[model samples]
Target chain A: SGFRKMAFPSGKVEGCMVQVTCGTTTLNGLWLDDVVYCPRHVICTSEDMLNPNYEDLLIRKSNHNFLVQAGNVQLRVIGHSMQNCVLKLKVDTANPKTPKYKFVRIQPGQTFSVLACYNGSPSGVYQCAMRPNFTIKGSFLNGSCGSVGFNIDYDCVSFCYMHHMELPTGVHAGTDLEGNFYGPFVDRQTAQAAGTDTTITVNVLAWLYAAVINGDRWFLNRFTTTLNDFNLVAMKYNYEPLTQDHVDILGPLSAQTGIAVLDMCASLKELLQNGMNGRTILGSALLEDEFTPFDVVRQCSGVTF
Target chain B: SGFRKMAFPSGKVEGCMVQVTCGTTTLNGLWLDDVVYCPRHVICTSEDMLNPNYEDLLIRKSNHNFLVQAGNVQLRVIGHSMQNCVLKLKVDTANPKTPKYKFVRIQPGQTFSVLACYNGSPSGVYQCAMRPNFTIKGSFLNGSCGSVGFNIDYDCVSFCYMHHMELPTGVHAGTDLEGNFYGPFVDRQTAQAAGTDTTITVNVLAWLYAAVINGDRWFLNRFTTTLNDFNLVAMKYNYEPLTQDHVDILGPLSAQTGIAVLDMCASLKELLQNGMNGRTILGSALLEDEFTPFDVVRQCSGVTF
Candidate 1:
């Protein structure tokens, strides 16, 4: 009958739209019936909502793997390299005075394990749903050493049918044409077709990563590299930083897409092929069907269309 | 011009080879006229090592990487597969009465890194010397999860512009034809060529180490299938368990033939191709040349063939 509604940080249900900004005219415009129907991208939470003390948590930098509890959420992080590594909150320099603590950043080339839950109950809500009717086990949340994007090239976690991949090829970590960094890179096969080989400020080369030969643990990533900036874009539009609930509920993936994790997967692929693009992976032209009604993605997992 | 001498776990300097059973061999045999020319392999330490409480240690089996302290030696170990892992002192099954504690065993696929010092002086007596000297930056002393043997294929850390290898094309882990276990295997491109393809138990694929993807602060390891008992192998080795003082001292890797690191590298390549014929990586026909005066491996630093 009706879509399950969520009361996000801004305190609004999914289907009702609130004014973009009434400027000063908002004196008494709201009563008991205002449903701020904001799209998923614009869904933001003030830093005030998260556990303020997460920054002070002294991570055991000596060990390769450990857990970080920020607010109500917990991240079981693992360092991929045995080098000198430090994991800390990325400061929002632009908003220095009252900075927002958004996503966690690890030096590029290193990946951290994260989750992506799938709600099994056909009647339950989607956005930040509950766990596995089906799931992806080792999705590593990948981030570059110094980059605005954090992404992954994920496999379908219909666990039973998903193929297990091993020993990657053509991996990389560096800057792109627009000076935006994209790494730990995709395999050469994937890059040859989509990655920007060269740009004015680019240090693009496949052999650089091709030569490195090492691996001690296996992992998967949460968001696809193509749409790594999805959360950033959403935070801007939503006019707030990400709430812990946003991360905890998203499980292994974090993009605004249809109910079926498979559908979101398809969207991730399309974004990959339209590679080396400009406003990063955000702009409007390439994203439509999913943005129009916005909440249209909040469907049941088993649905096809 | 003599071999460097240092005491080990028994607190006896190496090469103080004791008599087989001098019924009257007791009394002061350790006092005088004693030069224990014991082959490096037979070197043994006591259970007085570690936190020494024996079996009461708690291990977090969920993840692969961890830190453990042994005789003033702290090793950071990591396993390949996410399979349930274990850590304990190897008990003398033959002398099960009092339960002797041998070396530590985590798993076959996992590795524990100890020290290998190069007696850096011209009087330098390397291998198991002291560190804080130029050291092997990325050396992991690997032992197998189930195999009876655990060894390293190491180069003298003269720290020259030696080549960097990712491991050979056909490395192995699992069992030998003779109902025994030896893993993180000795080099294998040489072995499988001779070893029985179908022994009662064996896993011959280069699967031991799928590949490693290293970054500034991370690394990646892959597995062919689910984690098994012997799918991982050590890329290098040293003859001794590494004595602390010896580990602290140093030796320059110079044994005439230039870089024996290259020599050991060569012997390793030969041994891997030779397979499980003799007694592990140390043998008579397989041995004679290099390991004979095993200390011959502890030569000068800047020497190459």
Candidate 2:
């Protein structure tokens, strides 16, 4: 077969990229002609090309375990803490063996978390969610499959898991030579050995994963004590401010991560504290890997790298 | 003063108890006998006492940093790790410093272990009281005199103190034990030299006074843990559950204690746990001084001396 000439835009795709053609009526399965199109537009509605507000393909459900008695109820979630995501509620039984509940759509970011009680009786078992797109698409788009059978339960109380990880003897004893506990190591290895090129670089990404799975922020916070600026940046990063889409994505991700929600919050905070710029570790890779082209990377590298 | 003759039903006043004089035609300050003997006795009308309901008290125009935005906001408390108490929220504010939050009163035999949010935005300073009676007493009753405070702010969270008394290191562990660390002790001198007589005996009554003023449970639980059980009991014996009269007396007490309102739930639980009986500590005479009564000491000595 002769080589078919085609155009490809540089951006993060969910999976394999493909295309096709027919007669003069031109057809291509994978194509976005405009160079101005942003990554956020990959899943935007087909009808509204230029319109900023478009239909989203991905669907999500955030669940909340509401505790209501015979009175007014107020459910408060920090917009910063939830990355500007809309908070919704679903009511169901708390039993682990046999789960039965009702899912209700709530207003986005309602100041009052959840309300119940009619005629002096309460409507119980509310589950909350923050979804970018409540409408579900059956299959994957851009090779990245959408999560189905996905239920984000807001049943957990956020806590730092400190006692979970193991550390070197006296690693936490008396402040390090730097005179602080939280410092700038990139990874667990960096945390383990603080002062060598072989020093492990534990990043926010790794800690986020571990914190969600382990619920041990107490130890992690102490372990990463020397990581002051990092902690501030991470805190800002985790607590995404005013980003509704970020909140929607984070809520479900947090449900999956389970424990690290707070750690992730801390991570985001650390990022923000580092002047919210690329010089900070978290913002360093994002400008290129996901959001920029090679030429842009090269051009930005002189200033950022 | 020495030769006055007394009648059959005469009474005397001494110590913490007071006797009221009742005349035949007019009762002194409307004594209980007045209600019992009136031809058309009527029960005093209250807002609803037999079946008490929760009402929200709003500190209008207060700061709103402590507000949590979620539905069905509540404060959960765990007492002694063995029991749980919940104070359901009716209102929540977003500010912590001058927070405006309120909840329905929780009854006795309950402790606040964990607070779960179902729906609604909830926020406030978590505080506790000795009794819900203060709810009826209006804003006058502050029950946080000697309680602990658990403050959750948008930027940070902190626990003021704990409620369990650390057993004497020498008593629980050997002299080899240092500082607050303690395990089961094997030697008597190690235990004695550890200073059984020097064991700190706090005046829980004083702590309660402070807790009530603070309107927080941080101190109450701390007092319980730091002071011996006898101290807790003494304080308990002096205070009644939330009452109409406590608004003035207890409010300051609650605020001074620096304890969280959640601790009130815990204290109520501890109060009920003792259940009209004193906790018995074996071989406690070593700690009890000359104030020990002879008959009880004799009985205890004969049985296990």
Candidate 3:
């Protein structure tokens, strides 16, 4: 559940506070469930609050009457230090334009504040997208939360994407979900260790598909010479990246080039290895070199080859 | 007397173990008496020598070499160290037309061995220079012959120039003199303490001449009255520079920049009181423009009428 505070039109509030009640027996097992964005435009004074160290989200409606104040909110800025944090804000008054907001980094453990000022009477709806500092925070869920043994890992890159998708729909809430992947930058060793007990989550589905397609082409070529399905599958597994070993070998353009190769291989491998029966396999065999040149021998053998 | 070994044109040594000795009871206090430079075309080889390092040095016409292998001797190839203690080597051979040398920094206690190889043949002239590993061994009296004093300060900067003129006509022998003025890179405080009791040894005579000219200008401007013999002669005593402060203030460029104004005032006060009557006066007259001006106001009678 997310917290929301609203002030009436033509009304202003400073030093506003809100306390979240988890509604559970013990608060010890509680963490931030999720941040809900309430679209309401409020005007605020104080120049210091306008240049907040954290991101200022927009609600709805804009005018001189509405005031919104952001102060002392914790933000997680990306990077090893806080000095690298940068913020940019732009207000668009043109028709069919929305206000643009950006944050290079949000320093962890620091409070950010921003005050909004308006030129005319507050009227239009204001919607602001909420984003945390780019750093992830994790806490333990022990017996206090009805769990005897449990652990969790959170990372910025994966969490940020999850946060954006989860905003429209209220799906994943807690840090300890069944099949949640946390980071894109995590090393392979840590990923393996974490995956040993729980499910391993990675962003290599497309690459895996392409590797299988290439394996199918090689497997189809040796169709008539007593093909081994297990060995063909093994070949695909070898080409499919399961670790970071190929990262350095692929060079600077590996990400883009490897992804392209993965796409092509996935399409070819999927079309070739559809069925595992002799009749359908033999009937589909042709003398075309493009499909399988050795398939002609398998056709000649009347018995199950 | 100096020791000389020559290689005849026929590649045969005319002498074996010639017994060349320092004869000066104290070690390291001798210099080469005379040297006969091999004509530009003559070639010397190693088989003609009784000493190995010296033999190798003569076989190749190197710039400097050490005959005595007991102590560390430095071979200065080109430009000197900023502080004069470290000797640089001309390692660059890319452009034979204009060669550059870089300094090899040796700490207080470090020894190095090097092979001397030069233009095909070595010359008998080995002009090796020695620098002590500690400050105690570095200091030497103006004309004393014993080992250097412990309490005496050695000036490294002046030593660079002093060694060049040490032995007027020496070739086959070498003399090692000591000083503390290491040179421009050393801090002013250390240089002042090292050179406190020693005479000011100026490397470039023109620099001292410039200082004197600047100090004189300051004296004349402060005392606007016509020239006098006593004031001009007193200027000589103030010319001795024991510290960088003296040169920085009294030097021509410094005086003209108005840094020497106070010293100029002091010189005037000492002359005005001591020149006419033997009495000392104090208090600043230049603080304001109320003091006596350089005008012809004669005080003969009590009244001007």
Candidate 4:
């Protein structure tokens, strides 16, 4: 089960309180960075729930809300840490099980981490594999690092998604059962026709979404405020997009230029000219092609993939 | 000194061809990432040089040209690696010499790097320090770790600065002796005032400079194309600036809002509105405040800092 607060009724040995609502299945569980650990016996047993066999879910990166799907579950944001572990990944980029895997350096406050295979196997250590049988509680799992046995700790990590959500039916943007985030921004024409300044919220979020895809840091940073709960998480796994104009991302208006518009050499070269006055500042227009009024969870931590 | 081609004459001893021009000194030597290795006997020998004492320089991150000054020479772009060496820095974030310093992880193709002390002291090893006598050639420096000497390899690394340059003078934008890079951009009002679209170059870079500070990635990414030689180099060291409206950088104009606008907050939120139809896309206006048409180099590699 997930977390619970002492809000008047239930009393148990104690667990965290959290939840995730996806397409009619509302899971109240313990929410860690992305995975919400709901009690395995909870709604999962219901035929209507997402996947009864899976106990966890990988949340999709959203702009204002979290998108999720069943996990091993799956999962990036800040990435997984091999707490109490200091092993590096043994390279074999060719091995699907261990391809091109890397780790964040040991930062001061972060606990050290290792490359985990989601299926209880530690890649860098020799012969030792993790074997823990605790239900979502904070208990240490035991495993071996080498032929030698060490009380290897087992703290699972979610490592990598997409998806957008729609309004459940509010001018005040909200989420759908599917787990997409929705918010509002003023519509230029709508506001103009409505006459004397019609103002509100939901629509503004979608506008920020434009900024989201533009890959504009300022816009991205903009989400940190106005609609960040989702933005903070989604950005971590958002597609590491290539500037379409750079090739199809920056100045080549034709979307197809005879010159190698992909690189920096171009006619709109004015952006870099004028001695970098930041005048290009005036050109921060979000391309229509980048707008995604809705998004979807593309990948996760666990199986089948 | 530096490198030379057989075009007609000079046959220098295979040193790399590179240079960094600061103030009145023009060093044409081995150009590595940011530091240029001009022959010490060459320019530093002149009374007009930067600091006749040191030989190398740490380049200032510039937009259109290489900004530089003498170094320990100091240094960070990709950072230093202990190629052939694998020691971590004995961190002392408080020690100016070893302050809150960090390193990039073991990247493939990149020689493994270690934290260096600019003064030749390898921080991690037991008692070893890099010591080599050769001037600039790729050779090994010998030293010991834990009282045992290894035929240690001693490749040096540079690390961190700031600054901007101006056109030596050009409608086509060029560099000043001071090492600033200048390019062209059309000034709307000026061109509009003139009745015809008068066009050239110099002004554009200043506008991009606006983009540079606005910290707009699209525009920043914009630089990767048009003026990258300098943009690429300058970006690595450009002072990571904080957005003022976030505090003073974003919306809460009046420059003084009674509310806490520094975070993901209020008012002029239109920049993120309109269902993100990329509507905010229309808001890419450059703030006059971010315009720094002319830039100056603030730091470099050598001593006397």
Candidate 5:
């Protein structure tokens, strides 16, 4: 099928060798009629494709600029300017009427953070602009201003799950992490969508297990806390076991790893056994051969490999 | 007519003189057809009535029991036991399946408090029982146990309004006070119900105003805070001015009070003016003679009274 076809390759294929240009530099990489698989990260542009990361490399700042980061439900602003500036951050969720604005005064090269509790999901836009002239009245101007705005997008399932989960230890709950990062998982949803012949879900689940093994307390805490409530609701409503779906999605991916999958599963089982009661109960069912690690990922997240 | 009949009395009534018997003690009180209005606190027997204060007078301890108090989303347990007893306090709400049980070890005459957050309305039953023996059994037996339970009853309007309002100062949110009392108004829904032969709605509104004047912070807080959001939704939805219903209900009551009614209207007008922006903006339309105080009360609360 497409899975093995993508994993392995034939001798030669048309358009296999493609030229990738970054600024004034050009390089060659394999193009499989879909994504440009460059060994190292490189920019690709196609106006019609409307790539999700199309605007990532496009610089939209002048002198005084603002860097935006999401901390546990909070927006962190880093000011990079030639002089002193007052950074005004305006958070506009889907509703335009109730936009929240906070001002932070920062030196030329300093960072400032503002905390605010968001009521619902984190699907919103944050606009941050630095005002160099303190005397500007009414509203901050856009000329010498370095205004940066980013959109936070997530599918219903991941968004719902993330909101339900508690933030990992040492991380403040409710603050958004820097850029498009959502906890250990990136905010991108395109990779998780159907028709993407990739083992992203399996890799993500493996990453979570590795985190648990390495004593990533936050990951364990968030997963266990969220899953406890999630499973309780699922049980109450008599929803189908999410593990079954996870197994179906990860079955192909597990075939590639063979015994390595079993070892990871056993490690996770041991970790959960030593964890809380809910963790132990859920882990027992999750580590069974009928249930794959991808099922764990799918149950906690809405994503499939 | 029945309202005034109940509020005022004539010279003789059939069952005016009645005796209330409690166990071995007897007390004299006025028997209004349905309820026995006793002078001092006295227990009345009727298995079906389930009198709220029936168990208050029943002493079920020998220098060893628990005194439980409801404090803002928490249950405070004071153990006056002779020895160290593992006090198992099980809090059962409307849902029997998901009852919350907390075990606290208390030395003789010690106090222990448990905190738990309740969401939305405070309409639920909380049954707390104290167990004397630590290792005796699976469930505490009621015969040898000092058990107490209280029901938090709220009408749809009061429940919905209370959920929207911030708890009054000094009053913990989500904890129901003794008796059928709402934040600002009493919870006598029969008066607010349609087709009642009384202007209970007018009196209830007056009582709310009186509470505001008497500095019942909870009442004022609930009224002003809820009305703010209530007005926002009303304005957004273009709902009819609540004042119309208030004027219609209070027209007769206001006619009897004359200047006192105007004074109360002016007081509410001034109060709303001093309140937040939403209160001030909505108060003008809400306090006009056409609107009436009862309308303000009814609009925010589901009940007319």
Candidate 6:
């Protein structure tokens, strides 16, 4: 059997005293009869019950925001019942099995920062959750029962692409995940459009897929951030979105380039959007026998497509 | 003419003041008048007058002893009028144009030592004299006229050979000419025979000439001590003493071996002495005539004749 029942209660009952026993022995300091009791407990609950109102607590949402800025992963815990909660931050680089963890004591209404390096490890992300500490009396707060977690994706390729497209002067004005300061000087761009944001993530990936499928004619001048970027471009042009079957067929690419398959397709949604754009352009340019629509677009943009 | 009158008086008078004139100019500080003047004069004398009684005043002999000990040439000025005198020591080594001079203040009844290095340079000797510094009346004592000089020869090859023969154990127990300690320890026929003596200069040369002429047969077991010993040995063999021509003929041996020809001949004397004993046995065994006497001698000494 892969599962076994825990002798301890799954969810701690607030304002109620309970004892934990295994066969004939009772666990010490686990039982309390009054207000002063075990500060926390291990809790287990049904997914539906935990998300009855569809608040999306476990994922980063409007209320629970997570972002990477200045080379640091930041988590904003809001409207949480616990004070000074223990947040466990884990970062997964290209190797998922080897994760780096940083424990932070964050209070409600405070943002906890985890320093991380953005040295072009594809599929890197920061996953953080308030680890179970103690149960509050007369409250539903318990081990993972009411806990929340947030993830901030670190798309180095997309980040690099957007950085290149936005700041082409060779100045690294953007901040990496570790808060290291760099520069691309500001000029005529509006202040609101000058800062980094999440939208560029989808845009850069879409642009990358489009450029790759179209023989990189669109991004001929863009510089690659990492060697794995070339592998991603090759994988997308040879298939649809990568799947297990496609992974088996293109297994040599990962072995030869030492890149993970999932990381190669992480921007599939954005790439599919670019595919739609390609189809639209194909339809519009079907009737032209000379001077294709790509040429027209390139001339209009003052670029050779 | 190669020689002429000095123009000045042949001998300066002690009591009469007289100025020396070189054509039109009078030499300064040279005029002397009474007993208060220069006590000594620059006198011109014949070779006979200098050696009339053979007083040995200028030459290092029984009365005037100059010797080298511990690499320092020492002069003992005895029975001299001055209590303190300036002894000037000069050494000429291969280059006669460049000589090294050292001065020491010597007093009557004491030996003045002149430090010198005797390392093997041909034609090197120390010439020492009691330089007349201030005449009794404070006048300059110039030239060799009234000065006595003694020469101490430093023939390095002969010294090395004597040192080697005297201390045959191959331990250089003697001090080298530079005062550097070396050894070939001493064994003695007696306490007095254990040290170096200046007599080796003439005796070693005579023994060398004798050995080369008579093939060293007469010097069989005799340890030669002086030139007369070699003369006696050569007389017994009906041979005349060696002359300058013999030295010139054998001179190349010195250059080739870097051992004074005489020193090389000294060793030959000892080898021939060993050969004589071998010859005495050859006469007793003359019935076996196949081997020559020279062959028998060489066979006995384990060497070629």
Please state the CAPRI-style docking class of candidate 1. incorrect
Please state the error at residue A131 of candidate 2 in Å. Answer: 5.0
lDDT of 6 by residue, B1-305 (tens): 00000011001111111221112222111111110101111111234333233223323332232221111222222322211111121212122111122122231111111111112100011111111110011011111011111111121111110111112211112222222222222212222222321112222343333233322333333233334554455444333354445455445434533445444445444543343332322112111112212212211211112
Tens-place lDDT per residue, model 1, A142-217, is: 1111111111112111100110111132222322212222333221123222232211000011101111112211
**Candidate 6 — which residues are off by over 4 angstroms?**
A1-305, B1-98, B102-216, B219-305
Listed in order, each prediction's TM-score against the native is 0.17, 0.15, 0.16, 0.17, 0.18, 0.12
Q: What are the fnat scores of the candidates, in the order listed?
A: 0.00, 0.00, 0.00, 0.01, 0.00, 0.00
Query: Which lDDT tens digits does candidate 5 get at residues B66-151?
Result: 22222223222222211111112222212111112222222111111111112111111111111111111011111111111111
Candidate 2 residues lying further than 4 Å off, grouped into runs, are: A1-112, A119-127, A131-305, B1-305
The clash number for model 1 is 81
Candidate 1 vs candidate 6, TM-score winner: 1
TM-scores of the first chain across all predictions?
0.15, 0.18, 0.17, 0.16, 0.19, 0.16
Best by TM-score: 5
RMSD of 2: 29.4
For residues B1-305, write the lDDT of model 4, one tens digit per residue. Answer: 00000010000111112223434444332223333322222223235242322313222212223222223232221221111111111111112222122121211111111111111222111111111110000101111111111111212222110011111111111111122221232211122111112111122232222222323323222111222333333233331122231233322221222123321121112211222332221133321112112210010001110
Model 3 residue A253 distance off true place after TM-score fit, in angstroms: 71
Q: Which candidate leads in lDDT? A: 5
Roughly what TM-score does model 4 have, to 2 decimal places? 0.17
C-alpha lDDT of residue A130 in model 5: 12
For candidate 5, the docking band is incorrect
Supply the DockQ value of model 5: 0.00
Q: lDDT values of the candidates?
A: 0.19, 0.21, 0.20, 0.20, 0.23, 0.22
The window of 10 residues in a row where model 2 chain A has the poorest summed lDDT is A1-10
- Model 2 vs. true fold: TM: 0.15
lDDT of 1 by residue, B137-193 (tens): 222112111112112223111111110111232222322212122323221122222
